[PDB]
PDB file of C-alpha atoms and ligand atoms in Angstrom:
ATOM      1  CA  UNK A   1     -29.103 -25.925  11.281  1.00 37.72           C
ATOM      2  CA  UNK A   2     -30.329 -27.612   7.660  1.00 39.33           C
ATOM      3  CA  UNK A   3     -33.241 -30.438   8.203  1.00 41.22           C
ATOM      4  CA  UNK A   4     -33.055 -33.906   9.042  1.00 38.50           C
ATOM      5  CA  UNK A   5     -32.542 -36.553   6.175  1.00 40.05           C
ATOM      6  CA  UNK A   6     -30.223 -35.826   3.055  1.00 37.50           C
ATOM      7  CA  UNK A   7     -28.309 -32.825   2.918  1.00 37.08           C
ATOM      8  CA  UNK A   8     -30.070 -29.970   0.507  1.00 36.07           C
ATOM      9  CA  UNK A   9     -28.381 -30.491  -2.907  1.00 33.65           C
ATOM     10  CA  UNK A  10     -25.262 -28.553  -3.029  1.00 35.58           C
ATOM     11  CA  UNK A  11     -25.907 -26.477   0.038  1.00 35.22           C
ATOM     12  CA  UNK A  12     -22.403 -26.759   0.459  1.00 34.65           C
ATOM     13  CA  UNK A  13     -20.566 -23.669  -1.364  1.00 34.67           C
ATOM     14  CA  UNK A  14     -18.330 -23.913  -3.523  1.00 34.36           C
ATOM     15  CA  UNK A  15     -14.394 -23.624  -3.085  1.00 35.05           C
ATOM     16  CA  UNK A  16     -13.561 -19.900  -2.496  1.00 36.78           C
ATOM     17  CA  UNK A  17     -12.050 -18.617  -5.934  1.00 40.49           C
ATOM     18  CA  UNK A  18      -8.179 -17.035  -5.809  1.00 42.34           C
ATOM     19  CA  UNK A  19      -7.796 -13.486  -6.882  1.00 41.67           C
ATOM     20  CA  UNK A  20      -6.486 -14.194 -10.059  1.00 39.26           C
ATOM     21  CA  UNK A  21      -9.358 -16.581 -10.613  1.00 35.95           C
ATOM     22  CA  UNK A  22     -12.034 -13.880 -10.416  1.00 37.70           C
ATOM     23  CA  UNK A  23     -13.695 -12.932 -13.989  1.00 37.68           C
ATOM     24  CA  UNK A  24     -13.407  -9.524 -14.008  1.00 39.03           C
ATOM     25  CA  UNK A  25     -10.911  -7.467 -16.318  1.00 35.86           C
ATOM     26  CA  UNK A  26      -8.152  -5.383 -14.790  1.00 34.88           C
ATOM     27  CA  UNK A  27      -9.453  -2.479 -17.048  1.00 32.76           C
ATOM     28  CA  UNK A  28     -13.227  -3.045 -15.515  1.00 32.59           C
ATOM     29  CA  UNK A  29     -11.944  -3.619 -12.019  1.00 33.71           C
ATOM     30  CA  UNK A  30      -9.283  -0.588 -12.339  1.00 32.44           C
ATOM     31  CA  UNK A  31     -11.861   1.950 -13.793  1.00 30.38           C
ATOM     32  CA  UNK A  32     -14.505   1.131 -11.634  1.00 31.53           C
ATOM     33  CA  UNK A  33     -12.169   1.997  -8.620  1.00 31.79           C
ATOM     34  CA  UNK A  34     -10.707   5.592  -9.702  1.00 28.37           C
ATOM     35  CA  UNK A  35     -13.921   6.647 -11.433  1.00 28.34           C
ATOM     36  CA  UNK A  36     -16.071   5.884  -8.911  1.00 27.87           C
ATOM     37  CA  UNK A  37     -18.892   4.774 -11.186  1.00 30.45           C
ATOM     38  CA  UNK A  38     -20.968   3.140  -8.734  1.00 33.05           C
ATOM     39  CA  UNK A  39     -21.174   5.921  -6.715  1.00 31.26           C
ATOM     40  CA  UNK A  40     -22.267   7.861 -10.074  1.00 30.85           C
ATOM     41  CA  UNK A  41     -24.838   6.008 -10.687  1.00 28.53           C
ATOM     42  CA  UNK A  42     -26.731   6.499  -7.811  1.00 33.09           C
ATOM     43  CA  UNK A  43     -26.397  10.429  -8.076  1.00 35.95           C
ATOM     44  CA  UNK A  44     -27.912  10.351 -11.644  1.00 35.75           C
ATOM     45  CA  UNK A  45     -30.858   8.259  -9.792  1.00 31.94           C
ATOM     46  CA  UNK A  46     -31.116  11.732  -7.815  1.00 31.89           C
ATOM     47  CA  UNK A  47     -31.016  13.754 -10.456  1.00 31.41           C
ATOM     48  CA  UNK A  48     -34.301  11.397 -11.946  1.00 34.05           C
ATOM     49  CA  UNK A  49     -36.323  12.366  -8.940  1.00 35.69           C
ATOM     50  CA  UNK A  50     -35.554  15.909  -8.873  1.00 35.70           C
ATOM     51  CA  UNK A  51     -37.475  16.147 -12.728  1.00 37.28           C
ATOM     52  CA  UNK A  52     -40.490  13.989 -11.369  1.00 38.43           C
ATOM     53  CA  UNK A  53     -43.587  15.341  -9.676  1.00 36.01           C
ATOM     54  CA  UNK A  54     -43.300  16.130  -5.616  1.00 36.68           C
ATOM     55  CA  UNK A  55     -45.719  14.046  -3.122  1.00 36.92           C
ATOM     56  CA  UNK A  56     -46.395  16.794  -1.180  1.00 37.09           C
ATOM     57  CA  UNK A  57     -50.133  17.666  -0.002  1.00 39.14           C
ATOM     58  CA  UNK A  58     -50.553  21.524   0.791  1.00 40.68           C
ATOM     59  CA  UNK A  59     -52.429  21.210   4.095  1.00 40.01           C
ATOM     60  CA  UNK A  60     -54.792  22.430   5.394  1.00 39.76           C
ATOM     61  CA  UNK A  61     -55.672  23.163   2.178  1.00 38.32           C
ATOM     62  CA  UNK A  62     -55.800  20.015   0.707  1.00 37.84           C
ATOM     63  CA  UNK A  63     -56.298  17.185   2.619  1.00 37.54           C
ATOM     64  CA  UNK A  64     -55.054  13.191   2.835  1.00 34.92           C
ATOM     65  CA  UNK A  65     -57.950  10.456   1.452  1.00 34.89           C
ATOM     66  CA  UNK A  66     -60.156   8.967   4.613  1.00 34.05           C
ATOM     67  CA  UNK A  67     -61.792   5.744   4.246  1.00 34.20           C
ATOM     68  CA  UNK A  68     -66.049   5.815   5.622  1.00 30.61           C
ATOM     69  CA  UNK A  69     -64.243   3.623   8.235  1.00 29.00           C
ATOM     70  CA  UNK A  70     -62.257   6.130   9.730  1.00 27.33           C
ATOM     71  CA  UNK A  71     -62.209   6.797  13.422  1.00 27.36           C
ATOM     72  CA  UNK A  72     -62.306  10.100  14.623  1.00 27.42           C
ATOM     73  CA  UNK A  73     -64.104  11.666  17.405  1.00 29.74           C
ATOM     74  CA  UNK A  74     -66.938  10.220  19.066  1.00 29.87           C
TER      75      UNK A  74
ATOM     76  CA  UNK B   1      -2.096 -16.524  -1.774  1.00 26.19           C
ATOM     77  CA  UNK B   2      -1.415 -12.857  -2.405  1.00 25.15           C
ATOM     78  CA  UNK B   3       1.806 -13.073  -4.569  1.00 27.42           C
ATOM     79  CA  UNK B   4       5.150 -12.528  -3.885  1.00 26.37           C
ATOM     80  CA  UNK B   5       7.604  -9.582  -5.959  1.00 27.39           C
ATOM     81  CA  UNK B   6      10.337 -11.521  -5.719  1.00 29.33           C
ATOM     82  CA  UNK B   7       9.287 -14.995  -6.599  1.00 31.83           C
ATOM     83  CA  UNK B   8       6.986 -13.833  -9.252  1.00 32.70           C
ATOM     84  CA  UNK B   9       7.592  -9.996 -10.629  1.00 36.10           C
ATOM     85  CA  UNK B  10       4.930 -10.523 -12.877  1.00 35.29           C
ATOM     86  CA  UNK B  11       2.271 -12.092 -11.444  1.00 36.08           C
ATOM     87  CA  UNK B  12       2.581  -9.633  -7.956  1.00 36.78           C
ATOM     88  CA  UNK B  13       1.900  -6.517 -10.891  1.00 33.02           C
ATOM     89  CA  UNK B  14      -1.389  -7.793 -12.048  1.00 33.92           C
ATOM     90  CA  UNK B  15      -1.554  -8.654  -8.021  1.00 33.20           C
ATOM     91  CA  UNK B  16      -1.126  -5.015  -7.168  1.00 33.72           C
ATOM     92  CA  UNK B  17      -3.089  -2.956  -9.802  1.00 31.86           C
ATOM     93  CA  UNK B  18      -6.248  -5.442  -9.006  1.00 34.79           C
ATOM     94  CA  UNK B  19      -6.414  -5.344  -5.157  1.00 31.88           C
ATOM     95  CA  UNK B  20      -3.814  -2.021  -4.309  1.00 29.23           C
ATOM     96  CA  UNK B  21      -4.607   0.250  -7.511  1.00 27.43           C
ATOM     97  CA  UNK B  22      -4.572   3.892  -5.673  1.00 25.80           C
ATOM     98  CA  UNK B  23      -1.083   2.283  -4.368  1.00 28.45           C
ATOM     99  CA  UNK B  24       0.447   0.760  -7.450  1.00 27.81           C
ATOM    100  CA  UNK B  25      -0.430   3.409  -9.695  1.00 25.79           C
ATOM    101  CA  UNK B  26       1.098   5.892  -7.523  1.00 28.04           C
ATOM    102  CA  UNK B  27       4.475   4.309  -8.569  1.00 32.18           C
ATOM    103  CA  UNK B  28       3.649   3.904 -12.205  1.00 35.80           C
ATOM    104  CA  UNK B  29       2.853   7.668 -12.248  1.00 34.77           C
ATOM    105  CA  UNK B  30       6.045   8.523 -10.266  1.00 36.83           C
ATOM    106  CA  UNK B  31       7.865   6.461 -12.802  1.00 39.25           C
ATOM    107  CA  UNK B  32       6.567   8.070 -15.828  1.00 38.96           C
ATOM    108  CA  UNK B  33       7.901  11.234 -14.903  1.00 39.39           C
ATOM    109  CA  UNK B  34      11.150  10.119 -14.775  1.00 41.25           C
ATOM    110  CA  UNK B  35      10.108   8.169 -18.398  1.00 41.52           C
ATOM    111  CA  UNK B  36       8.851  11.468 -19.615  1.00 38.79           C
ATOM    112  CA  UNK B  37      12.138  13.772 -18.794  1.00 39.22           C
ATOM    113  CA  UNK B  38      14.422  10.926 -20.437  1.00 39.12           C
ATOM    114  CA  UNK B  39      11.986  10.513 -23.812  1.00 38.68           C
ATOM    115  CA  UNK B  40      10.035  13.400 -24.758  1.00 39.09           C
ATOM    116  CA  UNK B  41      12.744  15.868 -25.033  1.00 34.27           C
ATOM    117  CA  UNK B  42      15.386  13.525 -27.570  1.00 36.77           C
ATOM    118  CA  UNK B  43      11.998  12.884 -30.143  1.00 34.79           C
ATOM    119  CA  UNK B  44      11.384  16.589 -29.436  1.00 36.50           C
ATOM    120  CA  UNK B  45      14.519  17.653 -30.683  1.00 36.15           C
ATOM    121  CA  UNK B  46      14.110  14.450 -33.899  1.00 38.13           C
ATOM    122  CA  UNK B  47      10.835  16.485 -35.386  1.00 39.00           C
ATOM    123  CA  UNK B  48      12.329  20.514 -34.949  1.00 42.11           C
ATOM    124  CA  UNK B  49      10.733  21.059 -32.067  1.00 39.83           C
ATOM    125  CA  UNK B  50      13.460  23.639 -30.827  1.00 39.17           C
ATOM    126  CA  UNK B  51      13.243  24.784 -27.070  1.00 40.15           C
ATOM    127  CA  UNK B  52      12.677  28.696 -26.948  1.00 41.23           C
ATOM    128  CA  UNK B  53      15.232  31.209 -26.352  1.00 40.38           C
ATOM    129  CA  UNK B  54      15.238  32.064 -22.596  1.00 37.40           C
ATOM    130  CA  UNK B  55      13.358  35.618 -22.034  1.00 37.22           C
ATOM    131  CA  UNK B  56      15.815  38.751 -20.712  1.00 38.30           C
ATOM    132  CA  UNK B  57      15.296  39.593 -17.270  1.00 38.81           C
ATOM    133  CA  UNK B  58      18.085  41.882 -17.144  1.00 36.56           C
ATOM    134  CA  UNK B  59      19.269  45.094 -19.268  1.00 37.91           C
ATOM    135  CA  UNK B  60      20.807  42.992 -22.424  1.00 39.02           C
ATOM    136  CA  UNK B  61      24.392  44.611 -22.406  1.00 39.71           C
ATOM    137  CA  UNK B  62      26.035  43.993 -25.830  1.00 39.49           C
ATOM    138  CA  UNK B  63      29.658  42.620 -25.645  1.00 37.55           C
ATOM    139  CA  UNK B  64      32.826  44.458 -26.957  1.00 34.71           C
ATOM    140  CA  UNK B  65      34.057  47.726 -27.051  1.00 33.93           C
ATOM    141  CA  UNK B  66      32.011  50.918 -26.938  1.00 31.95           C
ATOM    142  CA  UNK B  67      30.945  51.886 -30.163  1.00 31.45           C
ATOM    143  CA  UNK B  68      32.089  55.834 -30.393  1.00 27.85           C
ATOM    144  CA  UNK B  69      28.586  57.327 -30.928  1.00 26.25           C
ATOM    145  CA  UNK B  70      28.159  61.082 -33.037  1.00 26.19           C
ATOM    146  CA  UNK B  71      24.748  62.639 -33.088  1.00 29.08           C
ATOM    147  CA  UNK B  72      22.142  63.600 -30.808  1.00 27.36           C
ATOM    148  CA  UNK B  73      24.966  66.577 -29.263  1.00 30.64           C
ATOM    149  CA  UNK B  74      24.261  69.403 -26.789  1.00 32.87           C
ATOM    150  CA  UNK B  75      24.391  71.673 -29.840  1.00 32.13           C
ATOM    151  CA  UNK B  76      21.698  69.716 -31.259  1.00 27.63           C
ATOM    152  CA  UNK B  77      19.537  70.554 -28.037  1.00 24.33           C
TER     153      UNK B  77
HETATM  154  C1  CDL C 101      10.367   6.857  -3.727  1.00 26.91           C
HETATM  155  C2  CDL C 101      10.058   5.680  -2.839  1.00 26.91           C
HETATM  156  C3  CDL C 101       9.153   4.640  -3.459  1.00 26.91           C
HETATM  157  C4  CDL C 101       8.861   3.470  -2.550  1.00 26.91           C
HETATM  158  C5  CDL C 101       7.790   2.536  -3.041  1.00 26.91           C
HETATM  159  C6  CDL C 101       8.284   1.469  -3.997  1.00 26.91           C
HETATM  160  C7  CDL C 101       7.413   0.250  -4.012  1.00 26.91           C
HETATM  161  C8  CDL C 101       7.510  -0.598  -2.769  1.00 26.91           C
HETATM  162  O1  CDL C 101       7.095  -0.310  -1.685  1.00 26.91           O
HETATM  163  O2  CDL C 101       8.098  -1.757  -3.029  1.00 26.91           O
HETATM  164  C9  CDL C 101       7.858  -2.838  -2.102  1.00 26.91           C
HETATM  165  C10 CDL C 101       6.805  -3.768  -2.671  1.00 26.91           C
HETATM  166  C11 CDL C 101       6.373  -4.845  -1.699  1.00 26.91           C
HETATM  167  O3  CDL C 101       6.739  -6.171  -2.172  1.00 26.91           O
HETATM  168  P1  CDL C 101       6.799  -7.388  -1.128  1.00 26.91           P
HETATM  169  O4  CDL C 101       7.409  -8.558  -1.844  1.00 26.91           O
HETATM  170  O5  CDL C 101       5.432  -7.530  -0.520  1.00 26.91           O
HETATM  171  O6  CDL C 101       7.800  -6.806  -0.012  1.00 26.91           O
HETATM  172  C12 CDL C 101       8.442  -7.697   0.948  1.00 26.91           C
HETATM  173  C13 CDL C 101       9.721  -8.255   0.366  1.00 26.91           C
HETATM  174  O7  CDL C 101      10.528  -8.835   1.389  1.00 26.91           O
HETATM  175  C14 CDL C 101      10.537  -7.241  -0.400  1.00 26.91           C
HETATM  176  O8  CDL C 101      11.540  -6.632   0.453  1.00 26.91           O
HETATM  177  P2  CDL C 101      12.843  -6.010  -0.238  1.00 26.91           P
HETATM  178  O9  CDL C 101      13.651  -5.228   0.754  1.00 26.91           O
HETATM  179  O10 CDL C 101      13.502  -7.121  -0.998  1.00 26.91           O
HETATM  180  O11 CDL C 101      12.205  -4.979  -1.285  1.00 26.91           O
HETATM  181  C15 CDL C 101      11.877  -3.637  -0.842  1.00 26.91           C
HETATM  182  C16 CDL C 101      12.606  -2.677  -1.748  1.00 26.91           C
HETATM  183  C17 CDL C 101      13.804  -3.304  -2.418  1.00 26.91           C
HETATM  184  O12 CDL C 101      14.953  -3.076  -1.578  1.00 26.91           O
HETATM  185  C18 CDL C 101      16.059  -3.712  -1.932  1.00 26.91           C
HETATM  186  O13 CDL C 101      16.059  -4.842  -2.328  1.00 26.91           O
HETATM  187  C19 CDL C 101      17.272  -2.838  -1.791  1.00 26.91           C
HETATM  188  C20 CDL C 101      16.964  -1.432  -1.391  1.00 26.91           C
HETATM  189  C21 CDL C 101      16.889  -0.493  -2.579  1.00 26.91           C
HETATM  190  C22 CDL C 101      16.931   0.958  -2.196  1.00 26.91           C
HETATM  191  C23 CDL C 101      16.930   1.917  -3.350  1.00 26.91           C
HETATM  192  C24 CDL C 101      17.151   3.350  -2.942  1.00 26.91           C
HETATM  193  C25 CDL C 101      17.225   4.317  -4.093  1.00 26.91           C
HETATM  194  O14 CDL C 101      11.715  -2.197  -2.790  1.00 26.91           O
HETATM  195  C26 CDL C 101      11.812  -0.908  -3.137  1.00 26.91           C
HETATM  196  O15 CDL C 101      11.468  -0.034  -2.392  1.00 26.91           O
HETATM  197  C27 CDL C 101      12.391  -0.675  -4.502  1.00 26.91           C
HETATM  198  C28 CDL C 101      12.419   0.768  -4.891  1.00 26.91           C
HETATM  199  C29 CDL C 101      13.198   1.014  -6.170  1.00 26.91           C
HETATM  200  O16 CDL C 101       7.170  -4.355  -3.961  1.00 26.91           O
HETATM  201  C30 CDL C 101       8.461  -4.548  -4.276  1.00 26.91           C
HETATM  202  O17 CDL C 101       9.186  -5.308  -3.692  1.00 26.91           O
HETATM  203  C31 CDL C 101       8.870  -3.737  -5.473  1.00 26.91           C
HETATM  204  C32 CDL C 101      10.340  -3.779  -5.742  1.00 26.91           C
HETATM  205  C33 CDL C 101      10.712  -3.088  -7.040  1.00 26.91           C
HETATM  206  C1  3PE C 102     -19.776  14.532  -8.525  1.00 24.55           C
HETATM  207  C2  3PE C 102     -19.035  13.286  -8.120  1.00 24.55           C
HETATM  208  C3  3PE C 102     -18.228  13.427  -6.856  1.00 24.55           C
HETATM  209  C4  3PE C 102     -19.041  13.785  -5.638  1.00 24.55           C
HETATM  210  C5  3PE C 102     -18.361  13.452  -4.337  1.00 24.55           C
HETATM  211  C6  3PE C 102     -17.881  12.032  -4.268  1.00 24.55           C
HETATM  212  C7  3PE C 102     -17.126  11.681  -3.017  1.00 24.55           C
HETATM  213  C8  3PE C 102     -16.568  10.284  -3.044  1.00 24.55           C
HETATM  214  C9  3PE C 102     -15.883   9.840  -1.782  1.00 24.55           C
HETATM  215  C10 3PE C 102     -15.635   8.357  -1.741  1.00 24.55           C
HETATM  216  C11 3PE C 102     -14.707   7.909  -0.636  1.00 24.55           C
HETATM  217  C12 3PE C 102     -14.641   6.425  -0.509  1.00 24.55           C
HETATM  218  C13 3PE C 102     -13.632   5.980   0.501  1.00 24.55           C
HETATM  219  O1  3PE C 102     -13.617   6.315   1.654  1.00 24.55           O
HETATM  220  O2  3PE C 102     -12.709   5.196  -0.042  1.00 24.55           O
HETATM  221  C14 3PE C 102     -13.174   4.239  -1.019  1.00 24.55           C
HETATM  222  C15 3PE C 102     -11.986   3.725  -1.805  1.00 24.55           C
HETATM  223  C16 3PE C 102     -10.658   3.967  -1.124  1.00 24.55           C
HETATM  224  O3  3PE C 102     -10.508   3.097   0.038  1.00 24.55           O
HETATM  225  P1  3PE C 102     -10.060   1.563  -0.147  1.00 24.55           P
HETATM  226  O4  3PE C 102      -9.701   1.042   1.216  1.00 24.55           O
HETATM  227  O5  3PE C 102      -9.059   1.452  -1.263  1.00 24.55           O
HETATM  228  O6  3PE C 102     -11.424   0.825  -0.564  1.00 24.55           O
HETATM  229  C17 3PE C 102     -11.419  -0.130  -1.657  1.00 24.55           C
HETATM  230  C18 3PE C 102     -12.848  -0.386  -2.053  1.00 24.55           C
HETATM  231  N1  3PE C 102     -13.623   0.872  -2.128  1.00 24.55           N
HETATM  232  O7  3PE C 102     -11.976   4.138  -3.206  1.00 24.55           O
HETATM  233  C19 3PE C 102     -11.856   5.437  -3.532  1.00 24.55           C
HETATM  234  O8  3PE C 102     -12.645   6.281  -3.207  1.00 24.55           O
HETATM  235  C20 3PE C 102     -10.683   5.746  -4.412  1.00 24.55           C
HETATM  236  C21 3PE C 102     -11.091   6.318  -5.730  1.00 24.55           C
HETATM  237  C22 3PE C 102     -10.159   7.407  -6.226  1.00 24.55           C
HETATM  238  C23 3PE C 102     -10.586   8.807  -5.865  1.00 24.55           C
HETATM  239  C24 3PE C 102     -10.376   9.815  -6.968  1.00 24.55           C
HETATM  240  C25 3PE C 102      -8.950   9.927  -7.448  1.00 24.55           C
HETATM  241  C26 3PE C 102      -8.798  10.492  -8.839  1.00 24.55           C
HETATM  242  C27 3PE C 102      -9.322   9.601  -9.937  1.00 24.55           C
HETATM  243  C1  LMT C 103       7.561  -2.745  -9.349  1.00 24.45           C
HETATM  244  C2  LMT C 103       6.176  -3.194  -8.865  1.00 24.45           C
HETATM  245  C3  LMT C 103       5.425  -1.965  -8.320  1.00 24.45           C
HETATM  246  C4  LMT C 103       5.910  -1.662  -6.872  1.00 24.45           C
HETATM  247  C5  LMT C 103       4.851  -2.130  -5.845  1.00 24.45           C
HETATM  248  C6  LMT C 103       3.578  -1.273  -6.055  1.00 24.45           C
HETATM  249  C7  LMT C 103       2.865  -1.165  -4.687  1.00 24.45           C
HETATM  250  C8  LMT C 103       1.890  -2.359  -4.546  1.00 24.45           C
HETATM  251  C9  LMT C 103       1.232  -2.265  -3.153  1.00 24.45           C
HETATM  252  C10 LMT C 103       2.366  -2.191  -2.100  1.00 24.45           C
HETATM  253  C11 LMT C 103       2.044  -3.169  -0.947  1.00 24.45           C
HETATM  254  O1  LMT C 103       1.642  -4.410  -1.488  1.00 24.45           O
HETATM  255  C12 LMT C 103       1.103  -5.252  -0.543  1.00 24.45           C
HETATM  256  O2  LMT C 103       0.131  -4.491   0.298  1.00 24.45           O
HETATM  257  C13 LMT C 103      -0.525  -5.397   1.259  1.00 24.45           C
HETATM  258  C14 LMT C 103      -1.340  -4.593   2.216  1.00 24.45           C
HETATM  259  O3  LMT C 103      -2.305  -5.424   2.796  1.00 24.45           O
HETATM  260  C15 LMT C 103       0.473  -6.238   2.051  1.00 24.45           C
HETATM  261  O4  LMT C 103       0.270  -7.621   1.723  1.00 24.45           O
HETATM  262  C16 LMT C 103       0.405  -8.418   2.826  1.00 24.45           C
HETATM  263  O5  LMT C 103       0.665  -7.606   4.054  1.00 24.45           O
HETATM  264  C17 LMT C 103       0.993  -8.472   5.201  1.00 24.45           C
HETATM  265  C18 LMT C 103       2.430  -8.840   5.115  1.00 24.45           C
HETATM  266  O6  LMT C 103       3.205  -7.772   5.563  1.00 24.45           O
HETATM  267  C19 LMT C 103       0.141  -9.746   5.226  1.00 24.45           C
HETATM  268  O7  LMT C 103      -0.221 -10.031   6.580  1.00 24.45           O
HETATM  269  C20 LMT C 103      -1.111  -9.604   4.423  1.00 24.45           C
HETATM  270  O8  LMT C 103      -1.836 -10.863   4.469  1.00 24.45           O
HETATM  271  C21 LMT C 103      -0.859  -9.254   3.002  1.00 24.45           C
HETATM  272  O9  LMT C 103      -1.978  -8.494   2.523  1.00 24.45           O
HETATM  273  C22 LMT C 103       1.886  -5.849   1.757  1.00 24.45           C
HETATM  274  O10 LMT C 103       2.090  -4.514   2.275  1.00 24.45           O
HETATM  275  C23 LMT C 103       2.219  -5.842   0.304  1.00 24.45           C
HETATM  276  O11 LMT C 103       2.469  -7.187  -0.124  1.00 24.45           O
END
């Protein structure tokens, strides 16, 4: 599963870490939970796209780019 | 690894609001209701903050005897 010869150099992981070892504050850890600010993040993304210009092509209008390579009918 | 309330009261706490926080502040909330009735209310009464009279819901009858009334007769009418 890892090459022949030497093993990589520390491709072994490390110990697993305790729960009271983790860096993270109680405050951070606590507020992330209840406010849910992951989460809220990812709505505001939405709320980015939705005052940003659309993709959309009216067709048949307006029509999608074709290369002079394009194959159609014969 | 996950502590132990009885070996370590302490310890379990920080344990419990890290990895159970819906569940251990559920209790602390409980708690400071119970906190809040036996508190609030002395210090309330310590700055002058007097509890309002309670509002009639019945006809307020005055006590004692009748007060012999003149006026207001049938030969006023
Ligand atoms: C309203 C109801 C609220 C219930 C939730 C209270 C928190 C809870 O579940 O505590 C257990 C919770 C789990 O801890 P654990 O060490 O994983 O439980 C297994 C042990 O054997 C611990 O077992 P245990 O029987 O020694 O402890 C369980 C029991 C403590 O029970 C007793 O020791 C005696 C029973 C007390 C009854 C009080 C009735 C009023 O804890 C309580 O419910 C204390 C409530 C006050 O934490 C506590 O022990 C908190 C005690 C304070
Ligand atoms: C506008 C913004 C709101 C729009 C709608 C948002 C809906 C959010 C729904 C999320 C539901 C997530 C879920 O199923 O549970 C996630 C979790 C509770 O489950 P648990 O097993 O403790 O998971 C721990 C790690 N997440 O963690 C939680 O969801 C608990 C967070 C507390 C919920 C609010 C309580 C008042 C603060
Ligand atoms: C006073 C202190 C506040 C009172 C306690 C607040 C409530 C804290 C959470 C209550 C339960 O706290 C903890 O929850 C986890 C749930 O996986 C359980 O913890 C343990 O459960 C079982 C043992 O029964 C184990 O197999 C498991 O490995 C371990 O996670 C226990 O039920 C309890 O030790």
């Amino acid at each position: 599963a890892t090459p022949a010869g030497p093993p990589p150099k520390n491709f072994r992981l490390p110990p697993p870490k305790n729960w009271d070892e983790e860096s993270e504050s109680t405050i951070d850890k606590v507020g992330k939970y209840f406010l849910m600010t992951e989460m809220l993040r990812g709505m505001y993304v939405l709320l980015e796209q939705f005052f940003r210009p659309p993709y959309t092509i009216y067709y048949p209008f307006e029509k999608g780019p074709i290369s002079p390579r394009f194959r159609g009918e014969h | 690894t996950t502590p132990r309330f009885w070996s370590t009261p302490l310890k379990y706490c920080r344990w419990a609001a890290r990895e159970r926080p819906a569940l251990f502040f559920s209790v602390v909330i409980g708690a400071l209701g119970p906190v809040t009735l036996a508190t609030v209310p002395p210090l309330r009464r310590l700055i002058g903050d007097v509890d309002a009279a309670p509002i009639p819901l019945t006809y307020p009858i005055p006590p004692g005897p009748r007060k012999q009334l003149k006026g207001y007769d049938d030969d006023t009418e």
